[PDB]
């Protein structure tokens, strides 16, 4: 670490290019409106919330950027990608309002979006599709999200797809938020990939929601120590211009020592105090430092201020950071939390309008008046001039991408629709599909295959030699190999899955990984991707509780689909056959990057198990996209049941159908359920509508237009709820569901499928049991059945094992 | 960064205390049995999996620790807490077998656990409660969890609970693994908390499963750079003893430049080539270094090894780490992957046998024999001697704590069972119940309240001035403040929730944070938590999609219960009243920490909305713990319905009941549902048993005993699946479910509750719908109802909004 002083000494600091006095007036009307916006919200007394303190402290930092740095979207690129801290959004609204892009009515509807003319509390692209771009309130996601976005931009240039060199990625973070493991856990990557197009701006006010991030330490020192050692270039914006005369005449060099030794704890105690106190408790520490201020007045000393509130110091940091290459840069801005507000850390607001000199009489205030700037005024001219010099206004978002893509037709995957020679997996089918896509002239170089190291476990090697591994195995490599780091992989996937919006360059990512480590591990990011309108494919290989048989407890996935069905714009599929993988991928491609431009992303669970892949039944394509279709019906004069299966378990459900036919003369309808989740959501959409339209003609759930009323049994390699979620919509009296509830364990596939009461053996018992409960057959048949299949009816429930 | 050579010179290397030759014999047999286990497992041809290369490259490192460092559980403490590298498990099994703790039959049931006598693939306490302690196969969790396990032990000490000063926490990591954000993301905590009881061990064999961690770089300099910057004491174990004499004779330093300049990728091409090649590529770069090896033989040169394989160098690292105070230490051990595996990376097996002087004859080799050291042998004597000199063998686990806690009875929570004078929230109820627990002599100090900065939000302040905050606000502080860091908080909560087994000292933690950032954000730690048999409370505050109304998209939780019902040993609850949290909390305290010692943890979602809290009805306890109880019955002619609700929505269904009665004559049974998930499990369990017992009278699920056949309506502040999971068990032909499916947004509780279609008016419309559908009342009534209640029947589905 370096001395507790600015990185840029005054004799190396560029001359401030802007109108200081005019920017002051401008920013000040913004702090005010930002403040009016929130108070106005409070009066409503409807528990709306909203912050002011976080913004007053960083306002100047953003102001300098908005005045001399932030490039907005333009003809050549998407501009700088700014990850605005989520709690300073009213300040953005404030300036946005000044720039004339938000109405006053909208300011008043702060945190009241339901009716359509409001604004979200925080950056939420889903809710404000043309304004916000990057979801940041969930602390920690912003930092790592910006790192892989800056890396994705470099990716784009290196690949020759788009020159993104004029774009800079700004990640705006609080110091408190830097404790989230995701905040620094990936900063080493900024060095490996040399992201000199990335700048972390850390607002160092020293506190969280209850005191200094580290009271008896020095957060700036901690941040400087770890980032420096991570290879980043760190710039400290510590003190305002009032300390330069002081630091200059301190020949003893004792002031610096003093600043070095004071812990974040005393600095906070100083600012809640006053000049005299500081003269005594800080300068008063050494004779040499009491003499620096020896002739100053207590007031003057109080005027001393931190770097993060001096445009000149703030400006030098961003300028310097700008001309830096080979590595990312972090700016540690030293600031005062709750700046200008003072008192509390109705009328008493005039204090701020006094601190920043707001043009409002002590009269026209009880109304919380929004301040503006009419065309022709000095402030309005300067406001827009600086923004125009910098290509426009931000934040801003473009909902759709402009170009038309020449997606491959399903016929193009016609090989995947035929019976397959050898026995393969849904993963191999998946890899083959992506290969078909790689033959398409239009989308081949737009695909972004992304793996978390196990290209081995997913048969992606055969693709290394064809499209290469991105490695700025050179900088033209198409595949993004992120290693053991699912969060980083996900951020890359998200940068790619949203390139269509950010840089009007649709890219189509396919990120394959051990399904277990999907939503469970990077879940908050997946929810945020939904928020950012991500359009990509999340491929969860080695899925299913019983299919990744040997790995066990921490790898056996029989619940990922339950987590994904929580994300509204995520479409989930658990396909059993390659022709199903092919149809689903084509449809997804069509819906997301085709004319439709539907905002939704795909999740497809694939398998590491090989078996017979039959040819796609003529006319099945639509049923596959909807979630279900009948494979066949086997005859049987002694009875009839319906059998449903998905993923790797369908074949065992078919194995059952056959058994019931031959051993008990019970016929069946065999159904392939590619997506229980979609069927459920459809089921829910039909009943929601039907309930609100009592007199109108009802909507029958797709699943009820495919199933009849004979008794049913369904089994999947996922917990029962996965198949049970469609109960309400199934048109049959009896619906039994087998599942893999319970922690996973190591064994042969055979052994696990019996342990989890999901194989043919259990499907037949279940089927027979339903016949029995309705006098169609003697219960003893069910009993003799449990006996014949080696089924221990009294072992402990798999959930408890 | 320091020169690419050992941190501890030979002149500072202490004498090696063990018998080198005798430790090599023992290790080699260990090496042999681990290989035999996997190979034998392969033969079954059941795709069981398992590793070898992983262990092969780090055995000496673990070996030095088992002979001279690892402390086993004893009477004073829980010994050293070792987070063994998941994939080196066959090796840990290999040793335990030789120490006579695991049988040959068990070793043959490697990865075949279903039937009772096998061994898990990886460290899984739930699958081997007496052997394993800490789940580590999910990369990145072990290191962070360990940093916090070390902190927790400091806490335990500081609080006067247990002298843990002799326990050392070892985290065994792969260089590939350090890319997980969670891996380095929390390292400054170890510096802040001066955790000199923590040691990170990083097997740096440069090769990640799919390739290099950095072909073009030097991952060792990366780790070092960043851990040093974080404040850690770094010890690099680069080279073996053979070089010392070399590094000395080079009074020119070139061999140091040569060492420093050479890049990982390069260093790899070596290991796999031959003598000359080295003395030609490496020592062949400078006629000052190339001279150092002028005598040597192309094979004398090629024998130079890396420090990570040399016992002497490994001991020094582990001795200096043990001596260090005031910061943690990370040992970067340089090794060679698949060490000595010759060919591959009965000829194969024949190579190792010879390569390690494995006492197996050509006559037994083809039998893939396991080696044992008879009692009386020199090997058997020294192996057990070294363990006894260290308190026993490890890993080992104590499934139950031994002491008896005198738990507060339900009556002790008396005031929370009565009607509340003041309107409060289920969160306040939680704080109050926590206060009751703080008045119980027995557990008061065994409690560990955990929070993620946000205290004020959960009105946790009163306790701060009451039991203080842990900050070595003093070292005797009880509440653990982890700041904006869910992951860290959860690890802390994990250390505390498994203290009972690791230190035979029950500690009862209550972690409250924003429900949204729970499972969604740390889900993989939560699953790992179930594997670790954690017994504790996770309090999901500010929950319910519509209730944290102003925060919007990334804060509104209407799905965490969906995420928590995937964890088998997690008991979730969504209570509506204070009397319910009281009953729930007491029941979990009793179950987890009473004589039952059930291996389960709790997840209770609490609200931030105050409202009238009625008194608990008499005899309602059981139902509250089971998941449902009829709150009350509203008589009425014209019709009968059942109304179910949970969390903050129950209050609105009860308004919906009054309105149904008053305005439509429709009578009803109103049920408070404290846990839809538990009832659901109860339903699946009865259904599971009924199918497996065809000749028995169908057992009836509890919810079905509680309700009747009347058309039912359920509404909750969570997506529809929450109350729908029990459909199969509700004994009414009509069961219509309301829920908050869809992305959250900022608005008033009321507007949101109307937007998500869950408030009073929708409960009524839905109820009337079912009365029409049936036939009982004119469908025009449900038409007017829609009109009367200002219900927009044609607005978008909240799931799509």
How many discrete structural domains of chain A?
3
CATH topology of the largest domain in chain A: Rossmann fold
Looking at the chains present, what oligomeric state does this protein adopt? Answer: homodimer
Largest sheet of chain A: 6 strands, parallel
Tell me the structural class of chain A: alpha/beta
- Quick one: CATH class of the largest domain in chain A? Alpha Beta
Radius of gyration of chain A: 31 Å
Which terms summarize this structure?
homodimer; 801 residues; 3 domains; oxidoreductase; Rossmann fold; six-stranded parallel β-sheet; elongated; pyruvate dehydrogenase E1 component; alpha/beta; apoenzyme; five-stranded parallel β-sheet
Describe the protein in words:
The structure is a homodimer of 801-residue chains. Chain A has 801 residues and is an alpha/beta fold. Chain A has three domains: 1-402, 3-Layer(aba) Sandwich (Rossmann fold), CATH 3.40.50; 403-620, Rossmann fold; 621-801, Rossmann fold (3-Layer(aba) Sandwich), CATH 3.40.50.920. The first copy, chain A, has 31 helices and 18 strands. A six-stranded parallel sheet of chain A has the order 9-8-10-11-13-12, with helices on both faces. In chain A, a hairpin with a 2-residue loop joins strand 4 (207-208) and strand 5. In chain A, helix 20 packs parallel to helix 22 (519-531), helix 26 crosses helix 30 (760-772) and helix 30 (760-772) packs antiparallel against helix 31 (779-788). Chains A and B meet through helix 6, helix 7, helix 20, helix 22 and helix 27 of A and helix 7, helix 8, helix 9, helix 23 and helix 25 of B. The PDB classes it as oxidoreductase. Keywords: pyruvate dehydrogenase E1 component, apoenzyme, homodimer, oxidoreductase. It forms a dimeric assembly. The entry is titled "E. Coli Pyruvate Dehydrogenase E1 Component (Apoenzyme)". Chains A, B: Pyruvate dehydrogenase E1 component. Organism of A, B: Escherichia coli.
